[PDB]
Amino acid sequence: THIDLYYMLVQMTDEFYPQLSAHGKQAVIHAPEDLTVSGDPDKLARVFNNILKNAAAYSEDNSIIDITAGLSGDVVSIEFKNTGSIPKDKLAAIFGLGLAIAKEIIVQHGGQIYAESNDNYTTFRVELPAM
């Protein structure tokens, strides 16, 4: 069993399109269409939906949300980068936008989630074991 990760991210992107276009924002996926990971598909989809919800809420009007997914070594990484900042106290609490469930789902998959924010842009990074 496996997840065709590019088409999972695309279907999520299409669900967020009205929300994003209302503010002139855009999500763009950068990934090998060939990329795959193992895991619970409906659970991983909730992880990515929950992350994009945070990226949408803290992203500036008229900006792009970059979702970069790739394979490097033993790890498949999915990185969400947006323009805009999370308040440092809201960021230090992140683990309707709570990511504690997304984190344990990722933890149960043997992976990790990282969240960073400087005053220009915000990065969410999911790492998962490659097959």
Please state the domain extents for the chain.
1-131
Q: Quote the CA–CA distance of 127 and 27 in Å, as a whole number.
A: 20
Handedness of CA 38, 57, 30, 10 (dihedral sign): positive
46-75 burial, b at 16+ Cβ within 10 Å, e below that, comes to ebbebbbbbbbebbeeebebbbebebeeee
CA distance 112 to 108: 9
CB-count exposure of residue 107 (10 Å: 0-12, 13-18, 19+)? exposed
* Residues 85 and 119 sit within 8 Å (Cβ to Cβ): yes
Question: What is the structure's resolution, reported in angstroms to one decimal?
Answer: 2.2
Beta strands in 31-91 (DSSP E): 36-37, 64-72, 75-83
* Contacts of residue 12, Cβ cutoff 8 Å, sequence gap at least 6: 45, 48, 49, 52
DSSP 60: P
Q: Pairing relation of β-strands 121-129 and 75-83?
A: antiparallel
| Exp. method | X-ray
According to DSSP, residue 39 is labeled: S
Tell which phi-psi region holds residue 91, choosing left (phi > 0), alpha (psi between -120 and 50) or beta: alpha
